[PDB]
């Protein structure tokens, strides 16, 4: 799925909609769609999508698949640990942490994302493609390949506070 939990708080939030067609002889059968992200803005977020003949159906189905895929998102000081670049299918992306008091600076979709994972001050510029989907998949690809000081110094035989960001 993997492991939707409906137990935390939630804030569904919508990114787009298309009107998408399948032509069969005679008419043009088309099916509105939408992407969604869902998080607690307290340490959990993930996307979800679906298609239907109508919006409420689509968005709801999207949300039922939305909770089913998640990332833990190691956050620190209301901020991400460090800077990366995400990449997936030419929808590259670049983040960087910040002096606080800034507020998230980025584009529409990615703003809706990180605003829903409870991150406060961070800097970015989207890159490569402007398509809404693989943008996000870039984001969560990077956040899935991301670490905090406890995630690491465990591995290395030494320990934090001779080393820290």
């Amino acid at each position: 799925a993997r492991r939707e939990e409906e137990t935390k708080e939630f804030e569904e939030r919508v990114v787009t909609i298309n009107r998408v067609a399948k032509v069969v002889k005679g008419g043009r059968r088309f099916r509105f769609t939408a992407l969604v992200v869902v998080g607690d803005k307290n340490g959990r977020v993930g996307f979800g999508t679906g298609k239907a003949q109508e919006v409420p159906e689509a968005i709801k189905k999207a949300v039922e698949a939305a909770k089913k895929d998640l990332v833990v998102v190691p956050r620190v000081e209301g901020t991400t640990p460090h800077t990366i670049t995400g990449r997936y299918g030419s929808g590259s992306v670049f983040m960087k942490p910040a002096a606080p008091g800034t507020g998230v600076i980025a584009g529409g979709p990615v703003r809706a994302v990180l605003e829903l994972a409870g991150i406060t001050d961070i800097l970015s510029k989207s890159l490569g493609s402007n398509t809404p989907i693989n943008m996000v998949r870039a984001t969560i690809d990077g956040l899935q390949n991301l670490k905090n000081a406890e995630d690491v110094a465990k591995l290395r035989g030494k320990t934090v506070e001779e080393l820290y960001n």
Binding site: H82, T83, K147, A153, R156, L163, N165
Partner: protein, 131 residues
């Protein structure tokens, strides 16, 4: 003909991480063993064991992995490479990945991590990031 040894070492290393078998072989050199000791001091390595025969090498390494088998680095590369050599001061140096990884560097007094190079206020010729 090998234009560069850094490529040999770091590429056999990455190619060995993507496949996850522990041990690995390579012809030796002065700098290679120096930095390999640093990586052992990082924690990115378990162990090394030198061995000798006609004439160089083989600097044999045994790599390290979690119990859940996550690769301990994510990434790697040099910087100071042929054609465009590069340098940096003691003040100017980078703090990679705001503090997690490292940036190997050579000094007038030896090859070291970047941290000892800013504490000492001695810069030098950078070699490689790793993180």
């Amino acid at each position: 003909t090998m234009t560069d040894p850094i490529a040999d070492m770091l590429t056999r290393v990455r190619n060995a991480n993507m496949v996850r078998h522990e041990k690995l072989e390579l012809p030796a050199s002065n700098i290679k063993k120096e930095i390999a000791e640093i990586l052992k001091s990082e924690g990115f390595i378990k162990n090394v064991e030198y061995v000798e025969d006609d004439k160089q090498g083989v600097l044999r390494l045994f790599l390290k992995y979690g119990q859940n088998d996550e690769r301990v680095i994510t990434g790697l590369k040099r910087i100071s490479k042929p054609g465009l050599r590069v340098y940096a001061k003691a003040s100017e140096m980078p703090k990679v990945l705001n503090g997690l990884g490292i940036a190997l560097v050579s000094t007038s007094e030896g090859v070291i991590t970047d941290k000892e190079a800013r504490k000492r206020n001695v810069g030098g010729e950078i070699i490689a990031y790793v993180w």
